[PDB]
């Protein structure tokens, strides 16, 4: 109702994810598919490291690897930047600072390519400790909950 882009998310949308990464010179690629359902605020992906062994822990890539699929209920629909930018889409860029370790910098384009919502990303990480928690793979394979604070 509020933007035309919103119309594109009223059912289940197929998703493709593609990431090229380089962390401390350790290069890798990740490719993923699944689906998103903004009506429920839900998305599911299977993501494969296509270059062999992922040189960083999977949890560290979770935020990098689709805020257009957030459920924006009721009056929140008046504040849904992500869907209004579709189908042309948006660029999402981040720096991620790991406390007492290195940082990731990311640039992703999130857009429709035909009927598929695509997240195409590049990532570069630098200054990681070779036996800190990231490169030394000392993170548990799990994830907690967080609030992402948005401002314009």
């Amino acid at each position: 109702m509020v933007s035309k882009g919103e119309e594109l998310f009223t059912g289940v949308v197929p998703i493709l994810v593609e990431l090229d990464g380089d962390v401390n010179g350790h290069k890798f690629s990740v490719s993923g598919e699944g689906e998103g359902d903004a009506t429920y605020g839900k998305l599911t992906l299977k993501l494969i490291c296509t270059t062999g062994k992922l040189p960083v822990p999977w949890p560290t890539l979770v935020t990098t690897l689709l805020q257009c699929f957030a459920r924006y209920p009721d009056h929140m629909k008046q504040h849904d930047f992500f869907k209004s930018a579709m189908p042309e889409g948006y660029v999402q860029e981040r720096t991620i600072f790991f406390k007492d370790d290195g940082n990731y910098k990311t640039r992703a384009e999130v857009k429709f390519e035909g009927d598929t919502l695509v997240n195409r990303i590049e990532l570069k990480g630098i200054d990681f400790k070779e036996d800190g928690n990231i490169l030394g793979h000392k993170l548990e394979y799990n994830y907690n909950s967080h609030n992402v604070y948005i401002t314009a």
Binding site: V2, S3, G41, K42, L43, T44, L45, K46, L47, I48, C49, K53, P57, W58, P59, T60, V62, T63, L65, L66, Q67, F69, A70, R71, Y72, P73, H75, M76, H79, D80, F81, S84, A85, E88, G89, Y90, V91, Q92, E93, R94, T95, I96, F97, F98, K99, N133, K138, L139, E140, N142, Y143, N144, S145, H146, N147, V148, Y149, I150, T151, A152
Partner: protein
């Protein structure tokens, strides 16, 4: 230029460390539309994220199955 006609976000991920402790990852984010057209520019709010990482027992490649549940909140109806 990276949040032009767009948004920014900030947040902190808590990665659990094997055998106790938490590794912090502080995120700074900027989004900008790819097009030049009008978009909704929101008032301040948050996305509540929850996520679950699993494995496909039949998959031999290094992989992650990721579920996320995400709902916007933090703007109230009516006055304040």
């Amino acid at each position: 230029d990276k949040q032009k006609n767009g948004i920014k976000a900030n947040f902190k991920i808590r990665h659990n460390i094997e055998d106790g402790g938490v590794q912090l990852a502080d995120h700074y984010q900027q989004n900008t539309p790819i097009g030049d057209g009008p978009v909704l520019l929101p008032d301040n709010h948050y996305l509540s994220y929850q996520s679950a990482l699993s494995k496909d027992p039949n998959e031999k490649r290094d992989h992650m199955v990721l579920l996320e549940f995400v709902t916007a909140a933090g703007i109230t109806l009516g006055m304040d």
